[PDB]
Structure formats: C-alpha cells, structure tokens
Amino acid sequence: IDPFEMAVKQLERAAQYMDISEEALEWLKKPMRIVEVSVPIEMDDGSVKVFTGFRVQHNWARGPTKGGIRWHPAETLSTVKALATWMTWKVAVVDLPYGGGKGGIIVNPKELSEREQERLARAYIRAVYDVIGPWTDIPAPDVYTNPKIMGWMMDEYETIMRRKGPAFGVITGKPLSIGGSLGRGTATAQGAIFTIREAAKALGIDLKGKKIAVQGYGNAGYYTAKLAKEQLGMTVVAVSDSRGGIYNPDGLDPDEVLKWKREHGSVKDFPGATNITNEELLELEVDVLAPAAIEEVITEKNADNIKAKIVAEVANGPVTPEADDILREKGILQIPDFLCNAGGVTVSYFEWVQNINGYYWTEEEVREKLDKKMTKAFWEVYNTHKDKNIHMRDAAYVVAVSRVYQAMKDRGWVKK
Ligand SMILES: N[C@@H](CCC(=O)O)C(=O)O
Numbered sequence: 365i366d367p368f369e370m371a372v373k374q375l376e377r378a379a380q381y382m383d384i385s386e387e388a389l390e391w392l393k394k395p396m397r398i399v400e401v402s403v404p405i406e407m408d409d410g411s412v413k414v415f416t417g418f419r420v421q422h423n424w425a426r427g428p429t430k431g432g433i434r435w436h437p438a439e440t441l442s443t444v445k446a447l448a449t450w451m452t453w454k455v456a457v458v459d460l461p462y463g464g465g466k467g468g469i470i471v472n473p474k475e476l477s478e479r480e481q482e483r484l485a486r487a488y489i490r491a492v493y494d495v496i497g498p499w500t501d502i503p504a505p506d507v508y509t510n511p512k513i514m515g516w517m518m519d520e521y522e523t524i525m526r527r528k529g530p531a532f533g534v535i536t537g538k539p540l541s542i543g544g545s546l547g548r549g550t551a552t553a554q555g556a557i558f559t560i561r562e563a564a565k566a567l568g569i570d571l572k573g574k575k576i577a578v579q580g581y582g583n584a585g586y587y588t589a590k591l592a593k594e595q596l597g598m599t600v601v602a603v604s605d606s607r608g609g610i611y612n613p614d615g616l617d618p619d620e621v622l623k624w625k626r627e628h629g630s631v632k633d634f635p636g637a638t639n640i641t642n643e644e645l646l647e648l649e650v651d652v653l654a655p656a657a658i659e660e661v662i663t664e665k666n667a668d669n670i671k672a673k674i675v676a677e678v679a680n681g682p683v684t685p686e687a688d689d690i691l692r693e694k695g696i697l698q699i700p701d702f703l704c705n706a707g708g709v710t711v712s713y714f715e716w717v718q719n720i721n722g723y724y725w726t727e728e729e730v731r732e733k734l735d736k737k738m739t740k741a742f743w744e745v746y747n748t749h750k751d752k753n754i755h756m757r758d759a760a761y762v763v764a765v766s767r768v769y770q771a772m773k774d775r776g777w778v779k780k
C-alpha cells in the first residue's frame with residue numbers, strides 16, 4: 365500500500381468531479397522537486413553516523429511551500445511525497461499563499477541524546493539549506509519533532525544565512541523567545557472546534573448541552589474535548605487513549621482525565637466512569653465524534669454503527685472512502701480531515717506573517733484570525749458540497765485543486 369500511490373489515486377478520484385485538463389493533472393501527480401540528502405552527525409561515542417534526510421516540495425504555484433519534518437524510523441520517501449501532496453491541498457483549502465512540501469529523517473530519535481539530536485537538526489539544515497528559505501520552503505514541527513528542534517534548526521539556518529534577511533521566518537513552530545507565535549499549542553484543536561461549530565450551524569444545531577465523544581487523548585484530542593466543553597458548551601462523555609476508553613453519561617472533566625493519564629500513563633479506570641474500549645467507543649449516541657488518534661479507525665465493518673450527527677476527523681485519514689459513502693447515505697456531516705485539522709498549518713502561516721513583518725500579535729488577534737480563516741474554509745467546502753452534490757471530502761479536494769490549478773494557469777505553466 366504505497367502512500368504516494370494512494371495520494372495520487374485520491375487526486376484522480378477528485379479530478380473526476382471537476383473540469384481540469386489532463387496536462388494539469390499530470391503536473392499535479394508529480395512533486396516538483398525532491399531532495400534526498402545524507403545527514404552525517406558525530407555520535408556521543410565519537411563515531412560518525414550518516415542518516416537519510418528528505419525534503420519534498422510538491423508544488424509552489426501559490427507561494428512558498430510549507431510542511432513539517434518527521435523523525436521516524438519507518439520514514440520513507442514515498443510517505444514524505446504523499447504528505448507533501450496532502451500539504452498542498454491543506455494549504456489550498458484554507459487559502460494560504462503557500463505551496464506544499466514536507467521533510468523527514470529516517471531516525472529513531474528516542475535513542476538519540478539531546479546533543480545528538482541538536483547535531484542531527486543542524487546537519488539536516490546544513491544539508492538542505494539550498495532548497496529552503498523564508499520565501500522558498502518553510503519547515504515546521506511534525507512527528508517526533510518539537511519546538512526545541514525548530515529553534516536549533518532556525519539558529520543553524522541563521523548562522524549559514526549570515527543574518528541577511530528574516531531568518532526567523534524560515535521555520536515555524538519555534539519557541540516564543542525566538543520568533544515563536546502564541547496560540548500555537550492549541551491550534552489544531554481550536555480549528556477543529558471552529559469547524560464543528562460551523563457544521564452545527566449548517567445542520568441547524570445549537571451545540572450547548574449535547575454530547576461529544578473524542579477518541580485519542582494526546583494534545584489534539586485532549587484540547588479538542590476541553591475547548592468543546594468551554595467554547596461549545598458540549599458535554600464530553602467518552603475519551604480514550606492507546607489502551608482503552610472511559611465513558612460517563614454525566615460528562616468527564618478533561619483536566620482531571622489528563623491528570624489521571626499523566627499520573628498512571630493511561631486514562632483507564634477513571635473514578636465514577638465505565639471503562640470501555642475504542643471499538644465500542646466509536647459508536648456512542650453523541651452529537652459530535654472526534655477521532656484524534658491512529659489512522660484507519662472507521663471502516664465498512666463498523667461504519668453503519670456510527671451514530672454521531674457530526675464527525676470531525678482531527679486525525680489524518682481516520683475514515684475509509686467506503687465508510688465515507690455509508691456515512692453519507694446515513695445522513696451524517698463529515699468534516700474532511702485536511703479541512704478539520706487546518707488549525708496547525710493556519711497558525712504556522714500566522715507565525716510566518718509575524719516573522720516576515722517583524723511585528724507580533726497577541727492571543728486574541730491570533731484567535732480571531734484563525735476563527736475567520738476556518739469558518740471561511742468550512743463554508744466554501746460545504747457550499748461546494750451542496751452545489752456539486754458530492755462528498756464533503758470531495759468538495760475539499762475540489763476547492764483546493766481548483767485553487768492550485770488556477771495558480772498554475774496564471775503562471776502559464778499549463779496552457780489549458
Ligand atoms: N504536519 C503538520 C505541519 C503543518 C505546519 O506546517 O505547521 C500539519 O500539516 O498538520
């Protein structure tokens with residue numbers, strides 16, 4: 365199951381719903397630049413180990429490419445290419461002057477010390493310097509990379525760059541001390557909450573007092589539940605982790621559950637709550653269900669059993685296309701994954717804007733701008749959903765690919 369293959373198939377399926385020339389589709393099926401580099405670092409024992417690093421820039425018709433860096437032992441070039449392709453549509457659906465791109469190093473960072481991690485980050489920047497920049501390619505944190513590594517990478521880039529321009533804007537997700545942006549820790553959850561609110565408004569539902577079930581209790585799931593309870597006033601009845609689920613009709617307090625999970629490593633056996641598992645958790649009678657964990661969790665095996673009026677796909681591809689079908693004919697509004705979790709990329713654009721301008725904002729300004737962006741993106745996707753009578757996801761693909769195609773035509777890359 366080649367990751368890249370799946371992305372190309374999804375793009376073709378999408379192109380089956382819109383008027384796009386075959387030359388433009390052939391252009392969009394290939395990354396515009398792929399860079400594979402050797403990343404040599406000096407280990408703590410004195411030896412030199414060489415790692416494999418990637419930087420894929422799928423498309424830059426709309427502006428500089430944007431995408432995170434993954435440090436995973438199972439990283440492959442095809443995975444990076446597929447993720448860069450998805451990043452293109454993600455920045456296009458939420459309307460950002462960005463293209464799509466992604467990077468990665470095939471490494472197990474859990475067995476690297478802090479000094480070796482810093483050496484790896486600096487060596488990666490020294491290797492890929494010639495294809496990145498504030499107006500060329502802006503990396504960001506991703507799987508097993510965090511703001512600390514982002515700061516190390518920014519410092520190395522500034523050292524090579526001799527401070528001749530906005531070196532802060534070369535990479536996002538930085539610490540606040542060095543050009544970091546506020547509201548960035550709860551970006552994804554805030555965007556998901558905004559999309560859920562707009563979806564409820566579209567469906568004619570006032571969310572105050574109804575049930576939400578969240579699967580996955582990392583930063584995304586926990587903050588999704590928390591912001592749901594405060595901003596949307598909904599009742600959080602079920603949460604789960606990489607172990608099991610906890611359900612309470614009266615409502616769970618996300619802060620207490622987070623304390624429980626930190627203390628014991630799992631959310632299981634929470635006081636005054638029935639312990640359950642993920643499979644039966646996916647089908648509680650709730651108004652909103654927010655899968656925020658590992659991919660491929662809703663499948664034709666249990667798609668019919670889903671009873672949530674609104675499904676917000678915080679995670680990347682939690683729902684299979686077949687389940688997309690059954691959920692559609694069941695009457696359930698799905699927020700597509702790369703529209704729902706648009707908060708992350710959105711915030712990163714805001715941070716870049718701040719770095720380029722040299723002027724930073726506050727929490728309220730970031731929050732308001734994110735609200736407007738996510739509301740507009742959701743409403744465009746939903747209006748395409750209505751007008752073309754296609755799936756929500758397919759509408760997101762229509763919006764994003766239409767924007768990229770228009771940008772490609774405007775530059776004259778494709779003459780038709
Ligand atoms: N992996 C992140 C990167 C976004 C960013 O550039 O901040 C995402 O697209 O969700």
Ligand SMILES: N[C@@H](CCC(=O)O)C(=O)O
Pocket residue numbers: 552580582584656657658678679680705708
């Ligand atoms: N990768 C995250 C969602 C996307 C993000 O946080 O950037 C998850 O699966 O929970």
